[PDB]
Amino acid sequence: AAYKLVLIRHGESAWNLENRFSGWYDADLSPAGHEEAKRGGQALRDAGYEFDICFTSVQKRAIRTLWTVLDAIDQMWLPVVRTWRLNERHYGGLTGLNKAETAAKHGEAQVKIWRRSYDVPPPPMEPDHPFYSNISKDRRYADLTEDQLPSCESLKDTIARALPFWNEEIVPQIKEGKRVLIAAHGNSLRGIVKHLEGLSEEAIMELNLPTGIPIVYELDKNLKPIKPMQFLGDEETVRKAM
Amino acid sequence: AAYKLVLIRHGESAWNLENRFSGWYDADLSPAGHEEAKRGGQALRDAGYEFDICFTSVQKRAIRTLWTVLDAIDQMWLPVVRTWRLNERHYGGLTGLNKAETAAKHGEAQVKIWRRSYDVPPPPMEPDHPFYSNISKDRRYADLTEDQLPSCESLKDTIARALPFWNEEIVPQIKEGKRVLIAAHGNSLRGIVKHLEGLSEEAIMELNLPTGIPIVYELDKNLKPIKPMQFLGDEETVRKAMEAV
Ligand SMILES: [Cl-]
User: Which GO terms describe its molecular function (chain A)?
Assistant: First the structure.
């Protein structure tokens, strides 16, 4: 009816098929993941969607997804804004570890906590971690205060540092009538969804947004979903992601 | 070696090998042009260049060049700012016409004026032009005042609407120590070059920046180049385009 917001979670990354925890590691899209973005774009193109501004993280997999979509819908000229605040949730020490092995050393129970709990952050990424410098010392996050640069994040944490950007940067745009497109990650996107739908912690915990599929929201003048989220795509894909 | 400014002119476009006047037409890079950007990006990667902010036009060929470079140098996370003010010069009615035919139909002389004169704009793009709507009615330029949206531009006009961006938006960044990367078009880039080097009109009219090659400027405390523009890449590439000047 009124405001339409589109979200898109990047597809499979190189570390995804390596079965590793990525978090803030700047893993790139895998060929398949790239293809996913390509199809999502095609969906938006066929549905004839138009955007006015784009927001994404400072991570390849998301940015590249955005680029692919913009390319697909012939809107590479749209202004885009990058922000670490839309970054995937920081997985602390688990970063780089193989999920299967981690479950084996620490067990299912423990790993479900680390991945599916709302406010229990994973172990901190210590200075001796294989990716400490790679992440925490990346030029990219130079302007984060010492408190801002996380060593690990729980979904509640991720969400806590995202909503601010959504409130000072995205919301304004939506209110001015700008059709926004957000290309981000599972957990950061969860933050937006939880906020929009006012879902409980338990709820958002069980929600898993589809990858590469355009998620469309129709908001009323108060940025509230006048109906449930819908996914653009071919009968199979769309229905399948339900 | 104080401030570092890097400029890059997009490579061959689809209309380039079709030998057509593009102007504001959003022609995409040709496979070759894409490869150029890739090589250009690779040169920057080998030279280990780092940037903090990027500026480009609202035209595919330039934007895609930027993307390719950022990808090559693993800096896709850099903030990028798009602006029509860095757009290629608007070629008015000549837009879409074949250059060879235009020369034949209007005469070498007339075209050389439209193609190389400093202040003689080409014929205006009339509402019945094949690309009138495609260009002028593009959502993309919706916020341009009736005066800003051009129907044609002389090199002089282009520079006129590019410099204000350069001074108001880019210069500040450079002065704050941010390493800037500008991926644009021949004529808009000319505007920057003419300004930096204080070249004469006759001067910049003759200057033809290389395509796909990273152009490096070293500016002093007052954005004044301290040496001639250098080009990045393997000898055969740099030397080939070096010999141009
Ligand atoms: Cl971009």
Answer: bisphosphoglycerate mutase activity; hydrolase activity; phosphoglycerate mutase activity; protein kinase binding
